[PDB]
Each structure stands twice: as C-alpha cells, then as structure tokens.
Amino acid sequence: HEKVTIAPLVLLSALDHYERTQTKENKRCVGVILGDANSSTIRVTNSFALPFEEDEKNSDVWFLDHNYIENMNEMCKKINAKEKLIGWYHSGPKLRASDLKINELFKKYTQNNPLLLIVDVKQQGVGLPTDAYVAIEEKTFLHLPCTIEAEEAEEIGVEHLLRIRLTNQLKSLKGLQSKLKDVVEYLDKVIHTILGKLQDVFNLNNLQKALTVKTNDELMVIYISNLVRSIIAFDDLIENKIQNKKIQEQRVKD
Amino acid sequence: TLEPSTSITLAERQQLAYDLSISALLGDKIYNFGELLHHPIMETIVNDSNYDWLFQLLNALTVGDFDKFDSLIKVQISKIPILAQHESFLRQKICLMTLIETVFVKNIRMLSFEDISKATHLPKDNVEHLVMRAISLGLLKGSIDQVNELVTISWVQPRIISGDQITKMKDRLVEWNDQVEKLGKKMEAR
Amino acid sequence: AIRDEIAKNTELSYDFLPLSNIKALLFFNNEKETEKFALERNWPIVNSKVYFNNQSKEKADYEDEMMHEEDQKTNIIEKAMDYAISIEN
Numbered sequence A: 001h002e003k004v005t006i007a008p009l010v011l012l013s014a015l016d017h018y019e020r021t022q023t024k025e026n027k028r029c030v031g032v033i034l035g036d037a038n039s040s041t042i043r044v045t046n047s048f049a050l051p052f053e054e055d056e057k058n059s060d061v062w063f064l065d066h067n068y069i070e071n072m073n074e075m076c077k078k079i080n081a082k083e084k085l086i087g088w089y090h091s092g093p094k095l096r097a098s099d100l101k102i103n104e105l106f107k108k109y110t111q112n113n114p115l116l117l118i119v120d121v122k123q124q125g126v127g128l129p130t131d132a133y134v135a136i137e138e139k140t141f142l143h144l145p146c147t148i149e150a151e152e153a154e155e156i157g158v159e160h161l162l163r164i165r166l167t168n169q170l171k172s173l174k175g176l177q178s179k180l181k182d183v184v185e186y187l188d189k190v191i192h193t194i195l196g197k198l199q200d201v202f203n204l205n206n207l208q209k210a211l212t213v214k215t216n217d218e219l220m221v222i223y224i225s226n227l228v229r230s231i232i233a234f235d236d237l238i239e240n241k242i243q244n245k246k247i248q249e250q251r252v253k254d
Numbered sequence B: 001t002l003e004p005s006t007s008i009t010l011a012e013r014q015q016l017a018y019d020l021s022i023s024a025l026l027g028d029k030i031y032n033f034g035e036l037l038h039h040p041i042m043e044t045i046v047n048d049s050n051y052d053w054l055f056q057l058l059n060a061l062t063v064g065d066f067d068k069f070d071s072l073i074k075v076q077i078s079k080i081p082i083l084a085q086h087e088s089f090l091r092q093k094i095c096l097m098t099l100i101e102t103v104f105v106k107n108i109r110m111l112s113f114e115d116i117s118k119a120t121h122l123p124k125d126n127v128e129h130l131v132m133r134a135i136s137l138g139l140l141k142g143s144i145d146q147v148n149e150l151v152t153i154s155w156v157q158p159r160i161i162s163g164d165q166i167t168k169m170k171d172r173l174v175e176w177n178d179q180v181e182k183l184g185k186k187m188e189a190r
Numbered sequence C: 001a002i003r004d005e006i007a008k009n010t011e012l013s014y015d016f017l018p019l020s021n022i023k024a025l026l027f028f029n030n031e032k033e034t035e036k037f038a039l040e041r042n043w044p045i046v047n048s049k050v051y052f053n054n055q056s057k058e059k060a061d062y063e064d065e066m067m068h069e070e071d072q073k074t075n076i077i078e079k080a081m082d083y084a085i086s087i088e089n
Helices: A008-020 A067-079 A098-109 A152-159 A174-190 A193-199 A210-222 A225-231 A237-251 B010-025 B050-060 B075-079 B083-101 B114-118 B165-183 C002-013 C019-026 C031-040 C071-086
Strands: A031-036 A043-049 A052-054 A062-064 A085-089 A133-135 A141-143
Touching: A008 A031, A008 A043, A008 A152, A031 A067, A043 A067, A043 A085, A062 A098, A085 A098, A098 A133, A174 B165, B010 B050, B050 B075, B165 C071, C002 C019, C002 C031, C019 C031
Parallel strands: none
Antiparallel strands: A031 A043, A031 A085, A052 A062, A133 A141
16 A cells, blocks of 8 residues: 655654653653655655653543644645645554544544554664554554655765674564464463464465475576686786786886 | 444344345355354354254255255255255365365365265266366366366365464474574674 | 395395395295395395385485585575675675
8 A cells, every 4th residue: 555654864853752751651752743645655754743641541541732733734834845744653662542542633634544653762673663553444553564765865864873695584583483472372362263364374384396496407507607706806816916016026126 | 234333133133144144045155164153143043943954054064964954955945946056065165175174284285086076975977067167166276187087276265273283383484493593693794 | 245235236126026036146045044134134025026115224314404405505605605705805
C-alpha cells in the first residue's frame, strides 16, 4: 500500500522529545509526524511533539490538545507547503488501547487514514526502534514496513557519525526464536486459526531435489574467473615493480 | 456482521442459522468440512429436526457415508439430490483433505491415483472422473499420469489441527540457524 | 584371506549369485561352508543363491559433517577467498 519513508530528523527529535519530556515507560511521548502521504510510498518529512498526558491507570484517561497542530500546521504550512499532515507519532515502544482514540482524532486532520508511529526510545531491538501503524478495521491497524531515505544532507552530518554479507544471515534466529515460543505462548497463553494459516506454508525444508544440485552447475562457471580475478594480479605489479625496481635499483648512477 | 451486536430471537437465531446451516447444504461448496459450526449456531441449531441432519450432515461432512444419510433423506434434502453428488464431492474431498493434510507428511503430494483414489472408497472409474476432475472439482491442482495411474497433485488444499509440527518448526529452523553461526562466524565481520 | 576379497569382489561383481557359483568361487566343497561366510558376511540369501541387496555399508555413522561440505567449506572458501580478498588488505 502506502508504506512509508522514515526521517531520522524525526526519529532523533522524537527521542529528544522523549528526553526533553522526561518521559518514562509510564508514558509515551507523542506527537505529529509530517510528510506527504498520497503515494504508495508515503514520505515522512518531519514530526512534532504534541504536548500530552498519558495515564494507563485509567487507560482512556490521558490528555492531548489539537490546538498545537492548529497553530503548528499554520507555521508549518507557512514554513513549507509540503508539510501536509500525514499522521502522527508517539514513543511506544508498544501499543495501548488509548491509541485508537488518539488515532482517530488525527483522522479529522489527515487525508488518508493517518499514521501511528511507534518508537523505541531505548532503541533496543533491531532494524528500526520503530513501528508505524495505520488503523484499518472488528478494528484493524497495520504496520507497513518503512525505511530511511536521503536525507543525504542528513546522511552528511550522519557521515560524521559511524566511524557485504554476514549480517544478512544474522536474523536467522529472530522470528524463529519467538515463533515456536509464540506458539507455545498462545499455546499456553490460552493454555488462533491464523497460526494454522501460518502452518501450511511451513511445508513451503526437506524439499531438496536433484534440482538443488543444479546449483553447483551454476556455481561451476561462477568460479571461472577466480583465477582471472587474480590472474592480472598474477601478472602485472611485481613484474613492473621489479622492472620499476630494476629501474629504481639500477638507477643509482652517481 | 451480527456477531458484535443486534440481540435477536431464537426463531430468528436458529431458523436463519438453520437456513444458513441449510445454505451450507445448498452451498456445498468449496468444502467445508469444518466451519462456523464452531460459532454459536450449534445448540442453537442442533438440537434436532433437520438440525439432526444438519448435524448428521456435519457428520457426513466427515463420515461421508451415503446411507448413514441417504437413509435420513426426506424431501427437503432430497429436494436437492445433487448432494448425492456433493457427498461424493465430499467423500473424495473429505477423504482427500486428510489424505492431503497428513498421509504423506514428508513433503505431501502424490496420492496417485487409483487405490489411493479408491482409498476414498469411492471407486476407480469414478476416480476416472471425481479424482480426474480437480478444479473440475473446483479445487484440486496437479495432473494425471493415465499410464502409471498417478495423480499429479499440487496445493489448493487448506487444513488444520495443532500440537505437532509446532515443536518441529523451530528445530530445523534453529538448526541451520545455530549451525550457520559456524560459517556465520567472521565473514562480513572479518 | 583370499576369498574375503573375492567375497567383496563377488559382492561388487554380483548381487544375486547362485550358492553353487559362490562356492565354486570360494572353492568350497560344502556350500554351507560358504553359507556361514555369506551369513558371517551377513549376506542376504534365498535358497541356492547368495544375494546382495546392499553390496555396501552405505550411511553407517562416521565420515559425516565433512562433504557434504558443499557451501560450508566453499562458504569458508568464499570466506577464505573473501579473506584472500579481505586479508589481502
């Protein structure tokens, strides 16, 4: 569907919000997110703290004002027209039924169904400390995957930060970790049919056929250059370097 | 849709759910097999009268014996006799689904054909139709080896149950996983 | 000592061999002489003929975990090659 761009600026700021707000896990610092949502890839330009109150002692009890967004967008629009409201964020890390109320408030203010944003203010788990949800509805809400863009100007300052293969595997466990547990969770949580829906694609393995072995067929030619890869290495430098040395070492006139 | 709301009456409740349970029959279907019978249409529907049938039909939705029911048949059900085809449609599919769901587990497909198809205890020359028909059953995939008398099959079979492959699941999938880490040691790291 | 090899050679050359021939091979007078060996060899046998259903030991525990060393070794090879690419630094 509309799965979205992610703005580090947002992400950072939202955490400084979290920081600034002195928010603890008792709370989730919330606020507007900005972008333009029309495309099958929504973009997140920006995002804004909505000064807020959250109480899960009584869930539906919590406080927020729109008049921010009122005053906000005006300036924001005046700042940039592309800022048009795409949705909103919060801290998280995880959902609370208070959300849905919060959710639909923005539906007043959004073109499409507005966007939740989970953050992990502790940035703990994985790729993203983040989720973004959109109500669907029997309610639905849903996370489409998202990611960062360039934002190179960001990436440039980002370049001032940091400083091939393996990781690709490294999630090998993750879902599989919780997964069977997740079963045994629900298994011994209730001790749904979706799970059985998950099931049949398990057989989708031990599948391997001679069809497999055709791999090496391919893998054969794959290796042809392995010499040639280094054959030119196998050729040039120290030939010439010796020459160059023979030049240089014989240079040595006076 | 009514599921959340709308208090009703039983004569509204069952009789609809009857007609529903009936329209299961005048469905019949892409089977189905199992259904909303789980949901509180049951006791509620069955009980008795044609619900007995409607329940016994759920039995035939499993048992699939004609004369456990073609016994039972009065007008209303014989009113559409095509269930006599549908129960064959059942029996096959009913046999099939578990024959499909389990019997091969070991990357299930073959089931091919005849004795396996007569293992539906519906005979071989009807197999030459019923088993022969696939999405001419509305459903089955795969194909026929006439000579070797082999069904080629593919999916278009959904299914259920629990407890079993549950453990198996993570095992292999943590198996490579763990073992990978051996290879998965230094590569892009180093 | 001879015949045990022939036994395998037979076992290699043959699945199902008449008990006469194998005795003829084993140079025995009694075939039950052989029949021991065959059964001592643990050879599948019906009347009058020594059978080899499995001429060999296939599977049987060790010689495992190495070749199939399909990618793992090649992955390490890759890894190595990639270190031959990396440690090339």
